[PDB]
Design a protein around this ligand. Sequence first.
Ligand SMILES: OC[C@H]1O[C@@H](S[C@@H]2O[C@H](CO)[C@H](O)[C@H](O)[C@H]2O)[C@H](O)[C@@H](O)[C@H]1O
Ligand SMILES: [Cl-]
Length: 138
Amino acid sequence: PLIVPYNLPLPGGVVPRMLITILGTVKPNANRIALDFQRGNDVAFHFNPRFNENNRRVIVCNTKLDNNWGREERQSVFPFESGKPFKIQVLVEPDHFKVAVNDAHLLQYNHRVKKLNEISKLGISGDIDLTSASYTMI
Ligand SMILES: OC[C@H]1O[C@@H](S[C@@H]2O[C@H](CO)[C@H](O)[C@H](O)[C@H]2O)[C@H](O)[C@@H](O)[C@H]1O
Ligand SMILES: [Cl-]
């Protein structure tokens, strides 16, 4: 049972065929989860479940460059549920991050940050009991 906020080092950044796995359970009455795939201060890929945005449940994806958020990409499909165990798999592909939750495809996020091998940390935060975070080359 890891401590959130949690930092996972990604040694040598990311690369296509890299599969990052995050296992956890959403706390009861949750408000947010965040994954932050960081190139130093920058956030190459921010993935942000919000359980109550104007009484809607939304996933917000974005990039942060020199302290500025870009154009959000919003996803209607919301596979998370308060109180339940989840698995998030982030596969790096040549042209995007591909995200599946609970073995079901969720979304893709085109790479805006190009220096993938400098995206050397994944921050995991929000209303979760974090069980495990690891990566594998597939
Ligand atoms: O873009 C991701 C970040 O979103 C903001 S919340 C964000 O704020 C702007 C105003 O600055 C607009 O209201 C947007 O509608 C709203 O989504 C969060 O504070 C960050 O943590 C990122 O999640
Ligand atoms: Cl870049």
